[PDB]
Write a protein that binds this ligand. Structure first.
Ligand SMILES: [Mg+2]
Ligand SMILES: [Mg+2]
Ligand SMILES: [Mg+2]
Ligand SMILES: [Mg+2]
Ligand SMILES: [Mg+2]
Ligand SMILES: [Mg+2]
Ligand SMILES: [Mg+2]
Ligand SMILES: [Mg+2]
Ligand SMILES: [Mg+2]
Ligand SMILES: [Mg+2]
Ligand SMILES: [Mg+2]
Ligand SMILES: [Mg+2]
Lengths: 83, 23, 116, 155, 69
RNA sequence: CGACACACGUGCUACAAUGCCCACUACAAAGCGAUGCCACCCGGCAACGGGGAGCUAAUCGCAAAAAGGUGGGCCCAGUUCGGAUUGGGGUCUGCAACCCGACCCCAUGAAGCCGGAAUCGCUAGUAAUCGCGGAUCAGCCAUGCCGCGGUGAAUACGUUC
């Protein structure tokens, strides 16, 4: 996985948004295209309407899911099965 | 063997060297 | 269960025979045998009561094993299955997790084919 | 083939007893073209057979093959609405080919664990007259005679 | 109790894995064991062996809050 | 374009002892190589990292080939067979490995005891089996493809089908 010599890479733009609400006043319903961008410990609480090719899935983050990426809570596939 | 990893031949198989194929 | 949490077979070499212990593998074989200085060629049966505990003891307080070992990787998954990440759905269905193939193959998390 | 009579490959006699026959057997032994391996299990079996039988095992397997040489096999001939197991005087080249194919075949059958062990043990029995190696032959030659009603259909 | 149908109980000495000697009575004048309640985690206050983790993940992380504001 | 209750095709590994492992010891070729090939040194169990000499390359490098051999272990078990699966732990590349990269280490070791009807290849350095190079190429999911050599059989009566 992503190097450690190479720090946790966030889009930086997705990143200003969050810290802009962390002290100035959270929270609002952002609609990120950022999936690469790891979840981060200034983002919990927020309602990052992450995108997935077609729409923005709201996913309120918590102290039980961050080390992953935003591409890991907005599914790209919808599969109720076969038959 | 050839498919296994934790082995010389398995690593020889897949052209890598590690704890069981030392350069 | 002469061995912490399980009875290992005998007439076989200690080093190997430990692998019949959840969380005890080759890489961990020599370690204790090295740490316990117990020659891996001597058979478990042929072991010494003092060796037994030394090879028992040290093995018992440097890693996790068996029960408490299955106890971890479950929650590690159940959490996933709670947060519902991709590896969660791949377990929430019983599907491949490491980008594996799904049109065919993967017949190990699907088990024998089910008729249609 | 369709042209003319194919040729018989004459092999390079072995490097121990100076025989082409030996050279032939190792081949059947030789898997994946591992002549050194094959050449071993043979001259190795040649050792165990010596220890338990103090006669030049060269002769042993010189014998245990003739005992394996089948004289008459059957071959299917489907004249009209039926196929007839028409038996035929087996051929020499083939007989060696036949004997050279069950000893190993029956050796590989054998339950003992080491290669040179089995291969040898099949060597002895045939020199006596025992073992599935003689079984095939035995069974083969009499089904034919059990079908001696089709020799007129011979070829 | 009816004579002849009951395993005789006598003094019993149980032997934990943590040196716990259990002075009891039973059907085997001698029995050793892996664990004694006196050495069991659930008993031993809160001995969480290896995983006293504290659930740092995942809102911990924070190797580097080095990202601009 | 990597989906996935299914239904075929082409392969990889196998199900073991003429075998698996550890270490030790020789033997090719045709190729490729300048923000390329990476010597030697050192960190780390390692992938790899960092230093650093050499090569516009019959010099120098990739680089070791493997099957093999010489020793020791494994004594017939779903095992020291198989490495699928999963957790955990990172590398490296790349702006970015979440669907979606591969390389390294740990623990877990699933099905499989030669496979029904049916079917494929090959006739001599061939089939078998070992491994190696290159093109495509940031990395590459390559068991592919085109090439390269190593060791090395059986069999062909005959033409009815
Ligand atoms: Mg803030
Ligand atoms: Mg293995
Ligand atoms: Mg285990
Ligand atoms: Mg496609
Ligand atoms: Mg099928
Ligand atoms: Mg197929
Ligand atoms: Mg296993
Ligand atoms: Mg299983
Ligand atoms: Mg089964
Ligand atoms: Mg031809
Ligand atoms: Mg290249
Ligand atoms: Mg290749």
């Amino acid at each position: 996985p992503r190097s450690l010599k190479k720090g946790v890479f966030v889009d930086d733009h997705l990143l200003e948004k969050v810290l802009e609400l962390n002290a100035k006043g959270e929270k609002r319903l952002i609609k990120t295209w950022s999936r690469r961008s790891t979840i981060v410990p200034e983002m919990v609480g927020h309602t990052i309407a992450v995108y997935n090719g077609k729409q923005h899935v709201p996913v309120y983050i918590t102290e039980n899911m961050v080390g992953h990426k935003l591409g890991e809570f907005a599914p790209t596939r919808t599969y109720r099965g076969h038959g | 063997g050839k498919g296994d990893r934790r082995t010389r031949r398995g690593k020889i198989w897949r052209g890598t060297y590690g704890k069981y194929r030392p350069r | 269960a002469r061995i912490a949490g399980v009875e290992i077979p005998r007439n076989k070499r200690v080093d190997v025979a430990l692998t019949y212990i959840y969380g005890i593998g080759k890489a961990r074989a020599k370690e204790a045998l090295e740490k316990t200085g117990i020659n891996p060629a001597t058979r478990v049966k042929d072991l010494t009561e003092a060796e037994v505990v030394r090879l028992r003891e040290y093995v018992e307080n440097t890693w996790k094993l068996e029960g408490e070992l299955r106890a971890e990787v479950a929650a590690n998954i159940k959490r996933l299955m709670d947060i519902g990440c991709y590896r969660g759905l791949r377990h929430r269905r019983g599907l491949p997790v490491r980008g594996q193939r799904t049109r065919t193959n993967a017949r190990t998390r699907k088990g024998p084919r089910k008729t249609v | 083939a369709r042209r003319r009579r194919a040729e018989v490959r004459q092999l390079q006699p072995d490097l121990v007893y100076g025989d082409v026959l030996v050279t032939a057997f190792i081949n059947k032994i030789m898997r994946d073209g591992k002549k050194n391996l094959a050449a071993r299990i043979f001259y190795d079996a040649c050792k165990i057979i010596q220890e338990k039988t103090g006669q030049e095992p060269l002769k042993v397997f010189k014998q245990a093959v003739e005992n394996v040489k089948p004289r008459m096999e059957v071959r299917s001939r489907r004249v009209g609405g039926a196929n007839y197991q028409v038996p035929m005087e087996v051929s020499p080249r083939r007989q060696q080919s036949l004997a050279l194919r069950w000893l190993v075949q029956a050796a590989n059958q054998r339950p003992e664990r080491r290669a040179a062990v089995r291969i040898a043990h099949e060597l002895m029995d045939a020199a006596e007259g025992k073992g599935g190696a003689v079984k095939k032959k035995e069974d083969v030659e009499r089904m034919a005679e059990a079908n001696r009603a089709y020799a007129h259909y011979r070829w | 109790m009816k004579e002849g149908i009951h395993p005789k109980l006598v003094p019993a000495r149980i032997i934990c894995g943590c040196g716990n000697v259990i002075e009891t009575y039973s059907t085997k004048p001698e029995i050793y064991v892996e664990v004694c309640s006196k050495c069991h985690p659930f008993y031993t206050g809160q001995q969480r062996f290896v995983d006293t983790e504290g659930r740092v993940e995942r809102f911990q992380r924070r190797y580097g809050d080095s990202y601009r504001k």
